[PDB]
Write a protein that binds this DNA or RNA. Structure first.
Ligand SMILES: Cc1cc2nc3c(=O)[nH]c(=O)nc-3n(C[C@H](O)[C@H](O)[C@H](O)COP(=O)(O)OP(=O)(O)OC[C@H]3O[C@@H](n4cnc5c(N)ncnc54)[C@H](O)[C@@H]3O)c2cc1C
Length: 456
DNA sequence: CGGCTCGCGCA
DNA sequence: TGCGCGAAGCCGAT
């Protein structure tokens, strides 16, 4: 498709056709940012060769109703910042509301677009939208992987069983795809109020707000400032203050020593490639650098590999054969406790460590990476069936996590409950051969009282 | 055949 | 606290 610093393997054609005379439309979805965006850079390079301008279109679907206000505000406030950023470079943005399959097909014809570009996402509803758009448009339709360092269809062509199998593949293509980003060139040609979409959506999600007894909201929105500018500040402080002690205190929820980048990385407000570019150049603890790189490279992109090659990524059928056989044999085992969704949601279990994990999820919208395993694994231990446990874990994960509705969530829940990307362990009642995690093992690794007293 | 992102005993 | 074994099924290099 042309360009000096542009790798042609990051782009693949979804539909071939005669390139129109109008501008190039970039259908923004996952990577909501202006800097370090391959999809936005590829749309500008195409527009430069065709002597056309580049426009951005964002379709606001009804998916914000299944979520909550904490995710809707975090996204809308970032889109307000992105509008001024793109407007500074003479790039206009259009914000549509409704079905992307019907709205973007109408936008391409109404605006007489010449080439449509979109970003990559392995989720089901994105592939369903792209198929409906292809059937209604007559212009070329391209797809760019701007989220992963190595494109998903390039790192592997099949489902990866474990990380130590996917690890040598990723690090082998790293010297080719780890490159610096060129600056976005402003538009030479210039061819819906976000404040109203914010107030309308908030009033519709007000009854579903998570409250306390005194009708006070549980969400604390001052923990993570949304936007592209704030996301870069979280990156800088992590590499300057937290990266040294990461490899030693990454599993201690009493110490705020993780990167805290998952809410920004989910909405695409910060590029993981930019994070790797800056972490690699830093001089820090070599063990901590290798530990953080293994999280943002393999485990982040193997989760995209999981959902892209397993369409039932949120179902029991995606589990390995050994895990399904073990879970099916222990279906009739008597459970120590049985809790419904409402009891798991409000945090009314006998385990104070589990309840404290749920309060962190409800109050801050981001539960610590270590306690998320204890949170999900105990849901499987105290549920009717593995299907209900998978249902409850996915529901609370997508409802209250700021990084929810993300491939890392479904892969992480499939790891905790279904042993995906994991191996078998000692045979137990109810759980079977799935990895076990107890309250006593957490007491030997960190001060469990400080974590419980912090969140009641 | 080697080695994979827990619990547990022992310094 | 950090280290080493145990319990377990399977991929992938040959
Ligand atoms: C049951 C369960 C549910 C999860 N739900 C989500 C979710 O909804 N959204 C989400 O983005 N992540 C999810 N994760 C993955 C992981 O918990 C988060 O990425 C992490 O805890 C967020 O904090 P952090 O980015 O500061 O951690 P860091 O240690 O700083 O992580 C660095 C980055 O590496 C990646 N990463 C780290 N751990 C994982 C992992 N286990 N799997 C995949 N990528 C990882 C993420 O991009 C993360 O931003 C879940 C994990 C589990 C076990």
């Amino acid at each position: 498709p042309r360009g000096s610093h542009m790798n042609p393997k990051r782009i693949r054609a979804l539909k071939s056709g005669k390139q129109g005379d109008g501008p190039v439309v970039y259908w923004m979805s996952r990577d909501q940012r202006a800097e370090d965006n391959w999809a936005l850079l590829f749309s500008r390079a195409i527009a430069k060769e065709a002597n056309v301008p580049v426009v951005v279109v964002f379709c606001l679907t009804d998916e914000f109703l299944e979520a909550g206000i904490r995710q809707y505000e975090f996204m809308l406030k970032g889109l307000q910042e992105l509008e001024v950023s793109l407007s500074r470079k003479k790039i206009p943005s259009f914000f549509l509301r409704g079905d992307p399959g019907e709205k973007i097909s109408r936008f391409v014809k109404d605006y007489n677009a010449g080439t449509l570009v979109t970003d990559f996402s392995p989720l089901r509803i994105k592939n369903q939208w792209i198929e409906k758009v292809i059937s209604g448009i007559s212009i070329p339709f391209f797809e760019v992987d701007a989220h992963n360092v190595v494109p998903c269809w390039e790192a592997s062509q099949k489902h990866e069983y474990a990380a130590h199998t996917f690890r040598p593949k990723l690090y082998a293509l790293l010297p080719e795809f780890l490159e610096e980003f060129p600056e976005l060139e402003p538009n030479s040609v210039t061819p819906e109020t976000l404040s109203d979409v914010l107030e309308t959506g908030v009033k519709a999600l007000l009854p579903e707000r998570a409250l306390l007894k005194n009708k006070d909201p549980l969400f604390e929105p001052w923990h993570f400032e949304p936007g592209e500018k704030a996301a870069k500040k979280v990156m800088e402080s992590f590499i300057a203050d937290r990266l040294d002690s990461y490899g030693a205190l990454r599993n201690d929820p009493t110490k705020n020593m993780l990167s805290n980048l998952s809410p920004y990385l989910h909405f695409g407000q910060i590029s993981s490639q930019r994070v790797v570019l800056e972490v690699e150049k830093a001089e820090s603890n070599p063990g901590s650098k290798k530990a953080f790189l293994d999280e943002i490279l393999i485990w982040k992109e193997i989760s995209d590999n999981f959902c892209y090659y397993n369409p039932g990524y949120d179902g029991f059928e995606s589990f390995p054969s050994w895990a399904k056989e073990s879970l099916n044999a222990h279906r009739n085992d008597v459970r120590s406790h049985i809790y419904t969704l409402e009891e798991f949601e409000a945090g009314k279990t006998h385990d104070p460590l589990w309840n404290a994990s749920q309060m962190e999820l409800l109050s801050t919208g981001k539960m610590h990476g270590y306690t998320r395993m204890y949170w999900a694994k105990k849901i499987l231990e105290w549920s009717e069936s593995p299907e209900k446990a998978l249902e409850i874990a996915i529901c609370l994960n997508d409802r209250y996590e700021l990084d929810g509705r993300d491939p890392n969530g479904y892969a992480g829940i499939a790891w905790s409950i279904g042993g995906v990307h994991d191996r078998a362990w000692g045979e137990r009642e109810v759980t079977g051969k799935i990895r076990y995690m107890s309250y006593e093992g957490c007491k030997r690794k960190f001060d469990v009282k400080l974590y419980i007293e912090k969140y009641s």
